[PDB]
Every structure is written in C-alpha cells, then in structure tokens.
Tab-separated table of C-alpha atoms and ligand atoms in Angstrom:
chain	number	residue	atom	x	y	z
A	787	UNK	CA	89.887	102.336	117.703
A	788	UNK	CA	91.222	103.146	114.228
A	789	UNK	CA	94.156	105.116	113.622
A	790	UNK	CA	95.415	107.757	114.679
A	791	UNK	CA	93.385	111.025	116.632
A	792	UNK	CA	90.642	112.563	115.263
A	793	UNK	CA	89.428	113.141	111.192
A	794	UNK	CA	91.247	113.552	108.287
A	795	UNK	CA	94.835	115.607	108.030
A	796	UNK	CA	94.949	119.136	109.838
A	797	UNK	CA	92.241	121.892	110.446
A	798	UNK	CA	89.415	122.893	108.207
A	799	UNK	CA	88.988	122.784	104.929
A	800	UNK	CA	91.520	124.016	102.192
A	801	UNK	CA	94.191	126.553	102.811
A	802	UNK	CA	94.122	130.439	104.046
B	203	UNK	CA	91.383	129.537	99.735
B	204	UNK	CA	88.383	127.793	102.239
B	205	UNK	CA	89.531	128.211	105.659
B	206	UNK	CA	92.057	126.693	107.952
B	207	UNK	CA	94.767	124.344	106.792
B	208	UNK	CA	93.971	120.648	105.273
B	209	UNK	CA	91.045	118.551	105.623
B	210	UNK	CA	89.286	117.957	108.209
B	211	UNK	CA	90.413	117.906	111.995
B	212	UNK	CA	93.381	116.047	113.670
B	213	UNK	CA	95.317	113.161	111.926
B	214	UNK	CA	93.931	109.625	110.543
B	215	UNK	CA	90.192	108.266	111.887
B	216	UNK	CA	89.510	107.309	114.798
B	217	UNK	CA	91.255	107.319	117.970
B	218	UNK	CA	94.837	104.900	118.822
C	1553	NA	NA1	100.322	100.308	117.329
C-alpha cells in the first residue's frame, strides 16, 4: 500500500 | 538541532 516503508525520510525530527 | 536525523520514520508512506 503506498510507497515505500514507513513515514517520511529517516528518524526523528531535525538533526543532532 | 531536534533530535534524530530527518523527518519522521523510515522512507516514503505507506508500506510496498
Ligand atoms: Na513497483
């Protein structure tokens, strides 16, 4: 279903 | 900055 595997692009939410 | 690495969690939406 969709595209792809799971939410969005990587882990989290910004950087550090 | 925020935590982890991107946005979110895995790559795209949804699943294949
Ligand atoms: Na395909």
């Amino acid at each position: 279903v969709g595209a792809x595997a799971x939410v969005x692009w990587x882990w989290x939410w910004x950087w550090x």
